[PDB]
Amino acid sequence: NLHVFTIAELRAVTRDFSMTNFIGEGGFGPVYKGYVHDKTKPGLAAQTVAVRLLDTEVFFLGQLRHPHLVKLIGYCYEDEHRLLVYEFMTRGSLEKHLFKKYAASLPWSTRLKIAIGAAKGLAFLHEAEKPVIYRDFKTSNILLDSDYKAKLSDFGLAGTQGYAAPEYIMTGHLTAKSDVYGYGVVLLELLSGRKAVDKTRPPREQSLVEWARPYLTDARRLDRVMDPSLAGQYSTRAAHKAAAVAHQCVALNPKSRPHMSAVVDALEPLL
Ligand SMILES: Nc1ncnc2c1ncn2[C@@H]1O[C@H](COP(=O)(O)OP(=O)(O)OP(=O)(O)O)[C@@H](O)[C@H]1O
Ligand SMILES: C[C@@H](O)CC[C@@H](C)O
């Protein structure tokens, strides 16, 4: 289900790629904010979009449709340019909200909903006809809509930050379990409110994974890891189960890490 756009249409959509509509340029290329009006494409509702200038694969991407995957609306191939048109995620990436000092906009139930939605999207990608695996799955791959519903971005386009599973750093072999490790790191970020690696913290606290691991089996000392801004919003039972899910996902042994569908099944009851 993909619309084909010309560059002329995308100039209308992005106000000729105006400097004001540029929102950033990561590893996969620049992204511009835009708008499709009701008349822009037959059968396409008016909406805000994100246009990536990428730096037959698109037909497969168009099949990866799921409530927790950012929708690919269409594409444009012209004069050696390859552009992708996605639904615009109104609240942007999870790290903008989570790495705030307090992250008071993300109460416990919202963080659980984000964790569950991201797990559902990753399980869908891993269970696809051709398994879709990230090279660098991290917090910024989770984008948020106006309801803080989580949807995964940059799927199918493919360790200093701390999201790379240790065996992947050493070998570079892409496996679904490497994504599960990164998911576990993000879950620890959601539980703790802390970035995965923060060199300004004391040496033993720099790595969120290395520092939190001994505490994830200690229910009476789990409060040291939990975000202080969440105090009073969670039961110890729910916090310890979520911590145990994260603990399993960041297991040094990849065979210990769960399938993402099992992560969904373990986290959904906490809501
Ligand atoms: N569909 C979308 N809706 C809203 N914002 C988006 C969308 N896709 C990308 N963005 C935002 O556009 C900016 C550039 O995205 P990009 O993915 O290139 O950079 P990044 O995610 O910060 O870096 P990297 O992907 O290399 O880790 C980021 O702020 C990103 O969150
Ligand atoms: C703009 C009109 O010529 C249609 C463009 C196709 C490629 O969708």
Residue numbers in the entry: 4 to 58, 70 to 172, 189 to 301
According to the publication:
In this study, the catalytic base K124–Arginine (K124R) mutation was performed and the mutant protein ScRIPK-KD K124R was purified and crystallized with ATP. The alignment of overall structure between wild type and K124R mutant protein showed no significant conformation changes (root mean square deviation (RMSD) is 1.090 Å comparing 220 corresponding Cα atoms) except for the C-helix and activation loop. The C-helix was outward, away from the active center, and the activation loop had no electron density map. In addition, the position of ATP in protein structure of wild type and K124R mutant, and the crucial residues of ATP binding pocket were partially different. Other residues, including G98, G99, and K124, may contribute to the stabilization of the nucleotide through hydrogen bonds. The catalytic spine was also completed by the adenine base of ATP like the wild type. To explore the conformation of this mutant protein, we analyzed whether there was the salt bridge between R124 and E140 and the results showed that there was no salt bridge between them. Furthermore, the regulation spine was analyzed, which was not assembled.
We identified ScRIPK, a member of the RLCK VII subfamily, by a screen for sugarcane orthologs of Arabidopsis RIPK and rice GUDK. Thus, ScRIPK is a member of the RLCK VII subfamily localized in the plasma membrane. Furthermore, bacterial growth was measured to determine the bacterial proliferation inside plants, showing that transgenic plants exhibited significantly higher bacterial proliferation than that in wild-type plants at 3 days. These results suggest that ScRIPK plays role in regulating drought tolerance and disease defense in Arabidopsis. Like the typical structure of protein kinases, ScRIPK-KD contains a small N-lobe, composed of five β-sheets and an α-helix, and a large C-lobe, composed of six helices, an activation loop, and a catalytic loop.
